[PDB]
């Protein structure tokens, strides 16, 4: 079927990509990087994140597969030595598809973004102060370095370093964590991470400065004259092609405990 | 309809209970503490926790209501001055019912328990060492003070003090948090809180000592010759009688930010 | 004696400053903002921080006094209504002097800085990776948002929001805290805050990118072609003019617990 | 000189102890476990902790040496294969002595205790509530699982698992850390670890229940009718016999980062 392969760009990944293309030539597989039905990422989690955003407008028609030649490879569930077995199983097809929830970010002044890991907000230089509104209800005034809204699969990423909880991706939710919040007699935040279900809307509203540095996964953009930053669980989902059992908690164990 | 009222036992609660019973006498409401359809708790969260466990074998036939004369009152959404308005609205009925997930705890040597807040495990004196098995997969060996498995509505309770995240109760899940885990070159745990969906089973298995102090909400029991402690989201749910809008996040805001 | 008064610049502080100058005119007090022996700061902790850096080259000849018209005022131990009593006590003199330790920061490419609160390091855009060398011994490779080295009196400031401990200022030391460190199977940091005594030298050395954003208290400067960032307890100390008992732990209690 | 050797009691330690005694027989070294000038501990940190408390009334006349046959061995700076080299260097003598600060705990109803790692307080069953008084000044009312007061060398032990900072042992100080404190609209603690210098006195005073479980390093004792628990840096110090350079931060690196 229609497929494409992205590469980290280094020697090991560029070479591995060519061998898989040569192997796919022995089957009824057409290379097409415009409308691929299967996107193969060869590299690290950053490479996989690039492949996702490269095709984030055809997520309902694409199944992703990660091969890690990098260092950690959380979204990758294939080693380079297993590449030929992956080519054959992919050709036969009839695999299983697994879907992870995604995060929608809306910035009004309006631009929308889609995240696989998380979306964070910081100030453009001065102090960061925003009012946190949950479902039109004012919840807190946050003063600190910033805030991080994570997907379930993103909870093992930036969310984890901020003290957030690790969520199983079958839970359609988003998690808000704090970055170095000020808490004294005058300033007060919840402190704890917050896990929101589907259809809950978290809105960040400026207090004084209206310029923020907003990141969505890898890319980070300076936004000016911001009136509102809106977070919610996206209706879109990323789809993985799973050819064997690799449970999320074993993936967590192998990445943080021992492998 | 059939109802009963439990009281913290102090003067303000005992007196308030009598006035509500007298007010219910003016309607078609029968007092029955054997098969009540509505259980009213007058006191704090501990009193409400006692009322829940007093009727934990008729949860599918009971709607709970909390009136706080105590200090914090997280499960209570009524002030004592609103008691007469609650009597009338309760008599007319046709309110809305809201369900929160519960935690099932199984201790094999077999006894099962039901928690509204959380269930924790500690050692009976010596060091606490357990293997954490998730869905038959060994995830980690925990060494520390203990572990805490919380319900969604329990995340604002002991779970919060342990650094856990606050979850909305519409999310059918349980959250495992650590108590002072040892982490060095030799010993290693995930550190982060873990949020598990329905049908996931977390099993604690002893390494040396087999005696543990197991708590379920308020009650704490010493268990001997323990072979396994099993956690999972219960199939049973607690039902609340809601007569107005009191969102969970506003309940959180009023309890931790300001009220 | 020779004195000067700095002001937050708002109406309440500008007016209060003029009244104190008028009151000092009734004594043998000469206003001199070139070589003052007593520097009075009227405003918040940011105003006091500005006054300190304005005279950081005459710290051995200056005693500082803080009057808070702002919001929190941690370095201030005088309310505006007590200003006239402060003028009289200051004129009579013979007060007690109290010294807090300071932090020295050296940036080699060489520039040195002096901090009253803390000095932090972040990346200039890309990922932040530095080797942490303690007394010429390689301790760890840090990957994350950045690092924060705090003075004792600065431990209640940025250091506190990063999970650091609060130290009494009689302890000549500095405290290093982490900002969102990456910790997995591959990357590993100590996690815990580190408290270093006098004459211990903490050195940050770049791994790839050599451009860092270095902050010293309020000011934040972009440094290019950095070869080393060096932290150590300074030999210089800030001196306060104390006219009554205001213990550090009561100052902490009033700022975070209740006042 | 006069010496004694304590052993973990297992086969490897019991055998290693006999070989060192046989080696010491070739020098002018007299075995004496009543008034030893040098105490050698063969085992883990628990064995070393037992040796310290076994001779805590002759600390000014004893230098300690740790040999680790156990798992981690933080207070040990000798491997079993280096035992013969240790015997020779010990016989020649003229080594360097290094002193670490200790913690004094006073329990009034009066009994005093000496700690090398830490002293902790928990409740005897019910909820733990104590008023924290610092230098006769009421600082906070603590509600939670308990409190932990650590020595400098103990900061890498229980103190570390509670989020406390790691302090260099040249700093004569003690560090108080919290165990799962309750913090809401009504209950409030500092949250942060507190580092106290010499001559500062931290006093815990009961609010309702007067029975506490008090631990000093390994031993844990139930105390009844407690009126006050008093913490302060002890005037006594533990002395180590150091035969080479093993800096504290390298000891920390080897125990937590990699070795
Ligand atoms: C460019 N990065 C690609 C990625 C990823 C990644 N995704 C996961 C994941 N889902 N689960 C587990 N590990 C993951 N990694 C792994 O992140 C580690 C370093 O990035 C590598 O080990 C990846 O293998 C962007 C990511 O940088 C993260 N980040 C940004 N600052 C961070 C910070 N201070 N602390 C923690 N994360 C941070 C942030 O999540 C951002 O999206
Ligand atoms: C007897 N207690 C009744 C309750 C409750 C309660 N439930 C909630 C909730 N769901 N959300 C928000 N607050 C809650 N409280 C509020 O807990 C506070 C003190 O107990 C009061 O302010 C209650 O009002 C049992 C509970 O003690 C808790 N606990 C046990 N040690 C705890 C600890 N070290 N730290 C934190 N919690 C602890 C534990 O949860 C146990 O179930
Ligand atoms: C411009 N600021 C002036 C100051 C100060 C100050 N010093 C103390 C202190 N010693 N003890 C107790 N409170 C203090 N404040 C109080 O800080 C609060 C907000 O700044 C106000 O309530 C001050 O009253 C610079 C300071 O911003 C701090 N900062 C920068 N980001 C921070 C962050 N994310 N989290 C926490 N602190 C941060 C950082 O320390 C920096 O030096
Ligand atoms: C019986 N123990 C002997 C000791 C020690 C020890 N001392 C240090 C040290 N100074 N620095 C670094 N590691 C150390 N260990 C190492 O502690 C680890 C396990 O005990 C082993 O790896 C030791 O090698 C008593 C100690 O148990 C500790 N403890 C009690 N519960 C604890 C907890 N939940 N979390 C953390 N510590 C705890 C507590 O400190 C108590 O004194």
């Amino acid at each position: 079927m229609k497929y494409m392969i992205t590469s980290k760009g280094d020697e090991k990944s560029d070479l591995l990509r060519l061998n898989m293309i040569a192997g796919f030539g022995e089957y009824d597989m057409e290379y097409d990087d415009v409308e691929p039905e299967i996107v193969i990422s060869i590299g690290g989690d950053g490479t996989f994140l690039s492949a996702f955003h490269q095709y984030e407008e055809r997520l309902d028609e694409i199944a992703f597969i990660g091969i890690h030649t990098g260092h950690l490879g959380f979204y990758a569930d294939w080693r380079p030595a297993e590449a030929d077995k992956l080519v054959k199983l992919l050709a036969k097809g009839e695999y299983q598809k697994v879907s992870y929830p995604l995060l929608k970010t809306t910035v009004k002044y309006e631009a929308t973004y889609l995240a696989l890991n998380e979306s964070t907000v910081k100030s453009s230089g001065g102090p960061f102060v925003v009012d946190v509104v949950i479902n039109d209800i004012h919840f807190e005034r946050f003063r600190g370095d910033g805030l991080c809204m994570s997907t379930p699969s993103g909870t093992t990423a930036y969310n984890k370093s901020l003290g957030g909880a690790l969520m199983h991706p079958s839970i359609e939710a988003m998690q808000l964590t704090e970055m170095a919040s000020i808490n004294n007699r005058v300033y007060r935040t919840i402190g704890s991470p917050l896990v929101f279900p589907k259809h809950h809307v978290v809105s960040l509203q400026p207090v004084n400065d209206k310029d923020f540095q907003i990141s969505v996964d890898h890319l980070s953009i300076l936004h000016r004259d911001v009136q509102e930053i809106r977070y919610e669980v996206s209706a879109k989902k990323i789809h993985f092609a799973r050819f064997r059992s690799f449970p999320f908690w074993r993936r967590v164990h192998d990445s943080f405990i021992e492998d």
Side-chain angles (χ1 to χ4, degrees), chain A residues 96-110:
Chain A
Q96 301 225 281
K97 285 192 246 185
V98 170
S99 305
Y100 287 3
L102 299 168
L103 172 69
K104 179 188 180 184
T105 305
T106 301
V107 183
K108 297 181 104 164
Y109 308 93
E110 183 189 277

Side-chain angles (χ1 to χ4, degrees), chain A residues 32-84 86-99:
Chain A
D32 189 335
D33 61 2
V34 185
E35 301 183 321
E37 296 170 348
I38 292 175
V39 166
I40 303 175
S41 185
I42 300 186
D45 286 327
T47 304
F48 189 89
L49 227 38
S50 292
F52 163 81
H53 286 267
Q54 181 180 343
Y55 294 100
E56 57 173 281
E57 292 162 355
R58 296 184 64 252
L59 295 179
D60 56 318
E61 303 143 69
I62 292 181
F64 287 90
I65 305 181
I67 303 172
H68 64 279
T69 60
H71 302 277
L72 191 68
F74 196 87
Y75 288 111
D77 36 30
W78 287 101
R79 297 180 305 104
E82 299 171 304
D84 294 307
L86 179 57
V87 167
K88 313 177 190 302
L89 236 42
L90 206 40
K92 184 198 62 182
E94 285 98 61
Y95 39 86
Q96 301 225 281
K97 285 192 246 185
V98 170
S99 305

Side-chain angles (χ1 to χ4, degrees), chain A residues 144-145 179-182 184 187:
Chain A
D145 286 358
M179 304 179 182
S181 61
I182 309 184
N184 51 32
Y187 306 141

Side-chain angles (χ1 to χ4, degrees), chain A residues 36 46 104 117 162 199 215 217 231 248 251 258:
Chain A
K104 179 188 180 184
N117 266 0
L162 301 177
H199 311 289
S215 74
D217 299 333
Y231 291 118
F248 179 79
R251 174 183 285 101
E258 51 183 339

Side-chain angles (χ1 to χ4, degrees), chain A residues 170-182:
Chain A
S170 66
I171 305 174
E172 304 185 281
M174 59 182 178
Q175 181 168 175
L176 181 75
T177 50
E178 304 184 349
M179 304 179 182
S181 61
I182 309 184

Side-chain angles (χ1 to χ4, degrees), chain A residues 130-142:
Chain A
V130 294
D131 283 304
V132 178
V133 183
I134 306 178
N135 298 313
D136 305 332
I137 288 177
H138 178 269
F139 181 77
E140 68 179 5
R141 176 163 288 187
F142 182 95

